[PDB]
Each structure stands twice: as structure tokens, then as C-alpha cells.
């Protein structure tokens, strides 16, 4: 049937339906912190989430997406490596079955417990569907999660998951402030890459924050109670929904910090 994260339909299978899986600018990647080069030409990064308008949360059978109203310039990312303005459309996470895995990007081969992806599209292409087809169409802000202290800003997400346990379930999810999911530092690495789920389009400027956020064990345990399967189908816990690191292929990872 269709793509997923198991033995028979997982990442190692995706190239058959999506041949770009073996392409030249796939994500995620391992971030070698020693070979990443400080780039003085990077402009400062501007994360402007004050007027962000969340609409709904959805279990799509792979993750859950918190969706935003992107009909106007409300929540936008600009600066850093980017030209122009990138509008926030949704965020989601990738996580593990255990705390020792779950992130997509790795840092000197280190795997974090989870990874948050704030997905934005370049306004110069008018809508998400057109932007995701262009080499500079998307910008994903990636944030690592480690298990430690609770993240108070995540708790509203955590509490709604019981209502979207299975594939195809959604719920109203208004007034969620994504500022509550950001670490203190905006120090980042950047490189040109791709979507990490099918169709794996090579349209993304990746901006991966160096500083992880801490979430509690109880919080991530609640992510792990979600299901990949639909209602009244055999239960398959939604865990290990991460694509592993892909070949860098001579791409250059740039650091914003010395
Ligand atoms: Zn993602």
C-alpha cells in the first residue's frame, strides 16, 4: 500500500514511488559540527510569530500537524540565509520509541529524542502548492527536543492528542502560540535540502537550531500514545516516524555562529 515508517513501507522503500529519494539534495543529514563553516554573510534570522493564527490539529497517519492560517503575512521567517518572506503553514514533530532516537537531523551522529519542524513557504510563489515545487520555495526551522524539564508551551499540544489518536482525526486548535516552542538562542546551521516525507521535494532551505528545547518524559510519552492506524484498525503506535540521515553529496553546511 502507501508509504510509512515500517519494515515494508519505510524510508528504505520510498525511492520506488519517489525516485528523488536518491537525489542530490535530500534531507535530513548529519551535521558535522567541525566541518560546518561560519558564514559572515548570513543576515540576522527573524522569527516573527506574534500574529500567528493556529486553526486545527490533524493526525495524518504519519505525524500530527498543527495548521495555521497562512492567508496573510502573520507568522513569518526571514533573514538568515533567506531572501524574502516565508509564511508559516504548519508544524509537526518526528519522535522515537525511546529517548535515544527520534530526530531526523543528527549532530556529530547524535540522535535527539525528537525534532520539531516549523514549515514555511516563500510568498513570492503565492501559495504552498506552487512554492513546494521551487528550489527556494520552502524554509523549515528545525528544533531538537531532549528529555528533561517540561516545556510549558508544549503542554496545550500534549493535552489535545487524546482527541486525535488515530489517522484522519482532527480537532479545532486555535490560539496556540508557537513562540512557546523556541529555545533562547537562534544560533543555527543551514543547508539546501528537501522535504523529509514524500514527495521529498528538493525545495527546502533548512535552518536547524543548535540549542535544543527540553520536554518532559511525560510529554514525549504522550506523543507515543498516538496511532499510525485509523479508528477500528489494529493498533500501531505512532513512534519512530523519522527518516534517517541522507548523503550530504558535497553540500556545504554553514553556521550562523563562530
Ligand atoms: Zn518533518
From Swiss-Prot:
Annotated consequence of substituting residue 62 to A: Reduced CO(2) hydrase activity, rescued by 4-methylimidazole (4-MI). Reduced proton transfer. Enhanced proton transfer. Enhanced proton transfer capacity
One Pfam assignment: Carb_anhydrase
Keyword presence, Transmembrane helix: no
Top EC class of this enzyme: lyase
GO cellular component, one term: apical part of cell
Effect of residue 140 to H: Impaired activity
Residues given in the record as Zn(2+) binding sites: 92, 94, 117
Catalytic residues in the record: 62 (proton donor/acceptor)
Residues involved in substrate binding: 196-197
Site (Fine-tunes the proton-transfer properties of H-64): 5, 60, 65
Source organism superkingdom: Eukaryota
Domain Alpha-carbonic anhydrase as annotated: residue spans: 1-257
Phosphoserine PTM sites in chain numbering: 163, 170
UniProt remark on cofactor binding: Zinc. Can also use cobalt(II) with lower efficiency, but not copper(II), nickel(II) and manganese(II).
Activity regulation details: Activated by X-ray, histamine, L-adrenaline, L- and D-phenylalanine, L- and D-histidine, L-His-OMe and beta-Ala-His (carnosine).
Principal localisation: cytoplasm
Resulting phenotype, residue 65 to L: Reduced activity
Effect ascribed to mutating residue 199 to A: Normal CO(2) hydrase activity, but impaired stability
Subunit structure: Interacts with SLC4A4. Interaction with SLC4A7 regulates SLC4A7 transporter activity. Interacts with SLC26A6 isoform 4 (via C-terminus cytoplasmic domain).
Protein family: Belongs to the alpha-carbonic anhydrase family.
General function of this protein: Catalyzes the reversible hydration of carbon dioxide. Can also hydrate cyanamide to urea. Stimulates the chloride-bicarbonate exchange activity of SLC26A6. Essential for bone resorption and osteoclast differentiation. Involved in the regulation of fluid secretion into the anterior chamber of the eye. Contributes to intracellular pH regulation in the duodenal upper villous epithelium during proton-coupled peptide absorption.
Entry's disease: Osteopetrosis, autosomal recessive 3: A rare genetic disease characterized by abnormally dense bone, due to defective resorption of immature bone. Osteopetrosis occurs in two forms: a severe autosomal recessive form occurring in utero, infancy, or childhood, and a benign autosomal dominant form occurring in adolescence or adulthood. Recessive osteopetrosis commonly manifests in early infancy with macrocephaly, feeding difficulties, evolving blindness and deafness, bone marrow failure, severe anemia, and hepatosplenomegaly.
PANTHER family, A to Z: CARBONIC ANHYDRASE (PTHR18952), CARBONIC ANHYDRASE 2 (PTHR18952:SF120)
Protein name: Carbonic anhydrase 2
Organism: Homo sapiens (Human)
